[PDB]
C-alpha cells in the first residue's frame, strides 16, 4: 500500500523546519561517522597533497522523523536530503572536493522507525599533507584527514567514530605504487577557535616509501658511472690525453643526470639524502679526474711514480667508495 | 521549545525585504571583518599570482533581525543565508575563487538577540601579485589582498578591521618551501571610482625567497663546469684533440644548462641575477677556450712565451673567477 507510505512521509515533512537542528535548545545531537576508503589515487610530493575516494556515512537521530505502522527501513530518493536537516560537516585540510553526480548525485537517505537517519555520500577529496623530505627517498610520512563541524559548537553537536576502530574499512585493500600503508589511526577530540569549541575527528595513515624504483632510477646510474671511472686506472697512460677528456665527459654526464633528477622533485630548501649521495659520487669522480690529471702531468719525467700512483688509486678508490657506501647505508637504515 | 523558536524565526523573516540594506535610507551600516588564514598553497611567478585559503568572517547589525525572550545566540543552518541581506564584498585582485561545498557549502550564520549577524565563509582565492624579478632569486616580494564593496558607496557601508591589529590570525600557519613570511600589514582607506567612493581594506604580506634550492640546483653545476674548464690549463699543448674536445664539451654543457634554466621561467624582458651569473660563467669558459686558441696560435714561434702564458693562466683564471663571485655576491647580498 504505497498511499499509506506517501501519507506518512507527507505527514513527517509537514511543518518541518530545516533551519533548526534536532533537539534545538537542548542537549547536543550526537553524530556517528563511518568511512569506507575506496581508493587512494595519487600522492604528490610536489603539491604536498594526496587524493582519496571514500563512502562517507553519517548517523544521527531526529525524533521529528519517527514513524509508526511501517515495519521497514525507508530508503528515500536522495532529493529528500534537500528537505531535511543534515550536519554541516567539512574537512579542514582539503583543497578541492566534490560529490560524484553520475548518473545522479551519489547520495543516500535512509530513515528508521525510531527516527534514526542514515546519510551517505561518495566523495573524492584532495587533502593537504605536509611532508618531511630530509630522509627522502628513505622517508616515512603521516597524512591525516580532519573532520569538523563548521557552524555548530560542542554545545550543539558531538562527533564519534561509530564502531570504534572498526569505523574505517578498506584500508588493507589499498595498493600504492610508491608507498605502503604501515598503520592507520582514529582520534577524537575538541578544537577551540575564537568562536568556540568544535568537535574533531582525525583519521591518519603512516606511509613508508618503497625503495626499488629509486634503486633502479637514480642510485644505480650514479654507482655505475663511479665504477666506470675506475676502469681508467687499468688502462696504460700515454701522451694522447684521451683519459682526461673521457673523465671530464663522464663528470659532465653525471652533472647532466643529476640536474634532471632534481628536475623531477619539488623545490625544497634543504639537502636530501639522495642529494648527499649524489654529491658524494661527484666528489669521488672529481677526485679520480684530478688524480689522472696529476699522473698525466708528472708521467713524462717520472714514469715509475706515475705507475705507483695509478696502482695505489686502483686499490684506494674501491675501498673508500665501499666505506662511504657502508656509512651512508648505515646512517639512513 | 522548538515550536516557539520556529515561530520566532518565522516572525523575524515575515515582512523582511532582502532587497534593502539595514538602515536603508539612513546612516551607513558598519561591517567588521576578520580573516583566519589556513594556508598559502602556492606562489607562482609564471602566472604572477598566489593561492590563499581563509576563513572570512563579517560582523554587522541588522535591527530587523532583533528578537526577545530567548537569551541565546541562534546558530542557524547556512541555507538561511539565502534569505538574509549580506554585504556585497568582493576581492579586486582575485582571478578565480570558490566557496568549499563539501559536505555542504562551508558557510555559517549566527544571530544575536540585539540583531547582530555573524556571517562566515571558507574561501580559496587565487589572487594576482605582480613581481619584480630583477633580483631573482634573491628578490623580496609584497603580495596583497584588496577587499572592497561593489555596489554600496561610503554613504551606505563602512569597513573596519575588527580588533585592529589582531583582525588577521593564522599567519604562523603559512608554510612555503620557497618563501618565508617577514611581515604582514593591515590598511583601511577609500578608493574613488567614477561611480563614487568605496571603502577598501588591504592585507599585505612581505615574502623573502630562500636561496638554498638555487645554490643546490643552479649555481653549483655552472661553478663545477667552470672549474672543470680549468683542467685544460694543466694539459700539454701537444694534445690538441683532447683540449678541443674539453672545450667543446664544456661549451655544449653550459648551453644546455642555460637553455633549460631559462626555459623554466617566465619570459620577462629584463635580466635577472641568475642570468648575469650564467652569462659570466659562459664568458669565463669561452675565454679559457680562446686562451687555448691563442696559445696554439703562438707556440710554434715562441714556445717559452706560450708555456709562460699557460702557467700564468693557471693562476689568473681562478683568481678572476673568485673576484667575479665576490663582487656578484656582495652586490646581490
Amino acid at each position: 500500500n504505497m498511499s499509506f507510505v506517501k501519507e506518512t512521509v507527507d505527514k513527517l515533512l509537514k511543518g518541518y523546519d530545516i533551519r533548526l537542528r534536532p533537539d534545538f535548545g537542548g542537549p547536543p545531537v550526537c553524530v556517528g561517522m563511518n568511512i569506507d576508503i575506496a581508493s587512494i589515487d595519487m600522492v604528490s610530493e610536489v603539491n604536498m597533497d594526496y587524493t582519496l575516494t571514500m563512502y562517507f556515512q553519517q548517523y544521527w537521530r531526529d525524533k521529528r522523523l519517527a514513524y509508526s505502522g511501517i515495519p521497514l527501513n525507508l530508503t528515500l530518493d536522495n532529493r529528500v536530503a534537500d528537505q531535511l536537516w543534515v550536519p554541516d560537516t567539512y574537512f579542514l585540510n582539503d583543497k578541492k572536493s566534490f560529490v560524484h553526480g553520475v548518473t545522479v548525485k551519489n547520495r543516500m537517505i535512509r530513515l528508521h522507525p525510531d527516527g534514526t537517519v542514515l546519510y551517505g555520500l561518495r566523495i573524492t577529496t584532495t587533502a593537504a599533507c605536509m611532508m618531511d623530505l630530509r630522509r627522502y627517498p628513505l622517508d616515512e610520512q603521516n597524512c591525516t584527514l580532519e573532520i569538523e563541524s563548521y557552524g555548530y559548537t560542542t554545545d550543539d553537536i558531538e562527533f564519534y567514530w561509530r564502531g570504534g576502530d572498526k569505523a574505517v574499512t578498506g584500508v588493507e585493500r589499498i595498493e600504492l605504487p610508491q608507498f605502503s600503508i604501515v598503520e592507520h589511526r582514529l582520534v577524537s577530540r575538541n578544537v577551540v577557535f575564537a568562536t568556540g569549541a568544535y568537535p574533531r575527528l582525525s583519521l591518519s595513515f603512516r606511509l613508508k616509501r618503497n625503495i626499488g624504483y629509486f634503486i633502479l632510477q637514480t642510485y644505480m646510474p650514479s654507482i655505475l658511472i663511479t665504477i666506470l671511472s675506475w676502469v681508467s686506472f687499468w688502462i696504460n697512460y700515454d701522451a694522447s690525453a684521451a683519459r682526461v677528456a673521457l673523465g671530464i665527459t663522464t663528470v659532465l654526464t653525471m652533472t647532466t643526470i643529476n640536474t634532471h633528477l632534481r628536475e623531477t622533485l619539488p623545490k625544497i630548501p634543504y639537502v636530501k639524502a639522495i642529494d648527499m649521495y649524489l654529491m658524494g659520487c661527484f666528489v669521488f669522480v672529481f677526485l679520480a679526474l684530478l688524480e689522472y690529471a696529476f699522473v698525466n702531468y708528472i708521467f713524462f719525467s717520472q714514469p715509475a711514480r706515475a705507475a705507483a700512483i695509478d696502482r695505489w688509486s686502483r686499490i684506494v678508490f674501491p675501498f673508500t667508495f665501499s666505506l662511504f657506501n657502508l656509512v651512508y647505508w648505515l646512517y639512513y637504515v | 521549545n522548538m515550536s516557539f523558536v520556529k515561530e520566532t524565526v518565522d516572525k523575524l523573516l515575515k515582512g523582511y525585504d532582502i532587497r534593502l540594506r539595514p538602515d536603508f535610507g539612513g546612516p551607513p551600516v558598519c561591517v567588521g571583518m576578520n580573516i583566519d588564514i589556513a594556508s598559502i598553497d602556492m606562489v607562482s611567478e609564471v602566472n604572477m599570482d598566489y593561492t590563499l585559503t581563509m576563513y572570512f568572517q563579517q560582523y554587522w547589525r541588522d535591527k530587523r533581525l532583533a528578537y526577545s525572550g530567548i537569551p541565546l545566540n541562534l546558530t542557524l543552518d547556512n541555507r538561511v543565508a539565502d534569505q538574509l541581506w549580506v554585504p556585497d564584498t568582493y576581492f579586486l585582485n582575485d582571478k578565480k575563487s570558490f566557496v568549499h561545498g563539501v559536505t555542504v557549502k562551508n558557510r555559517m550564520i549566527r544571530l544575536h538577540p540585539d540583531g547582530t549577524v555573524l556571517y562566515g565563509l571558507r574561501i580559496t582565492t587565487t589572487a594576482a601579485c605582480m613581481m619584480d624579478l630583477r633580483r631573482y632569486p634573491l628578490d623580496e616580494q609584497n603580495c596583497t589582498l584588496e577587499i572592497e564593496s561593489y555596489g554600496y558607496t561610503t554613504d551606505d557601508i563602512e569597513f573596519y578591521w575588527r580588533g585592529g591589529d589582531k583582525a588577521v590570525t593564522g599567519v604562523e600557519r603559512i608554510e612555503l618551501p620557497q618563501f618565508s613570511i617577514v611581515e604582514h600589514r593591515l590598511v583601511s582607506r577609500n578608493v574613488v571610482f567614477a561611480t563614487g567612493a568605496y571603502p577598501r581594506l588591504s592585507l599585505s604580506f612581505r615574502l623573502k625567497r630562500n636561496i638554498g634550492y638555487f645554490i643546490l640546483q643552479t649555481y653549483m653545476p655552472s661553478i663545477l663546469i667552470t672549474i672543470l674548464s680549468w683542467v685544460s690549463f694543466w694539459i700539454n699543448y701537444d694534445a690538441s684533440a683532447a683540449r678541443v674536445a674539453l672545450g667543446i664539451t664544456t661549451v655544449l654543457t653550459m648551453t644546455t644548462i642555460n637553455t633549460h634554466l631559462r626555459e623554466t621561467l617566465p619570459k620577462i624582458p629584463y635580466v635577472k641575477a641568475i642570468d648575469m651569473y650564467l652569462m659570466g660563467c659562459f664568458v669565463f669558459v669561452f675565454l679559457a677556450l680562446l686562451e687555448y686558441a691563442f696559445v696554439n696560435y703562438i707556440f710554434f714561434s715562441q714556445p717559452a712565451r706560450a708555456a709562460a702564458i699557460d702557467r700564468w693562466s693557471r693562476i689568473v683564471f681562478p683568481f678572476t673567477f673568485s673576484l667575479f663571485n665576490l663582487v656578484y655576491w656582495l652586490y646581490y647580498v
Epitope: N93, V191, V192, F193 | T169, E172, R173, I174, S180
Partner: nanobody, 105 residues
C-alpha cells in the same frame, strides 16, 4: 632570566611551541608562540616589547628571555607543543605535549 625548552622526537608533526604561565589563583595564561621553521613569533599584550622568544633547530631549543620583570610575573611556567591543525594559538586545550612546570618569583 631565561627559560629553555628542548624538544625531541616528532617535532615535524608539532611545528609550533607555545609558552604558558599559571598563577596560584588564576587559570593558565598564554605568553607567546614560536614556529620551528618560519621563525614567526607571536606575543600576548602583557609581555609585548618585554619578553622575547627565539628558536634554534641545531639542538631543537626555544628560549624565552624575560626582561623588565614585575611582581605580577610570579607564576609557574610551562612549555607546550601544538599540532598543525590544532586550532587557535591562545588556548591551552589545543596543545598536546606539555613540559614540566618551572617556578619563577
Amino acid at each position: 632570566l631565561r627559560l629553555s625548552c628542548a624538544a625531541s622526537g616528532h617535532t615535524f608533526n608539532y611545528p609550533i611551541m607555545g609558552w604558558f604561565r599559571q598563577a596560584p589563583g588564576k587559570e593558565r595564561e598564554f605568553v607567546g608562540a614560536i614556529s620551528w621553521s618560519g621563525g614567526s613569533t607571536s606575543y600576548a599584550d602583557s609581555v609585548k616589547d618585554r619578553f622575547t622568544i627565539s628558536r634554534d633547530n641545531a639542538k631543537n631549543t626555544v628560549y624565552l628571555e624575560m626582561n623588565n620583570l614585575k611582581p605580577e610575573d610570579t607564576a609557574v611556567y610551562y612549555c607546550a607543543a601544538k599540532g598543525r591543525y590544532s586550532g587557535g594559538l591562545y588556548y591551552p586545550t589545543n596543545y598536546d605535549y606539555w613540559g614540566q612546570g618551572t617556578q619563577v618569583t
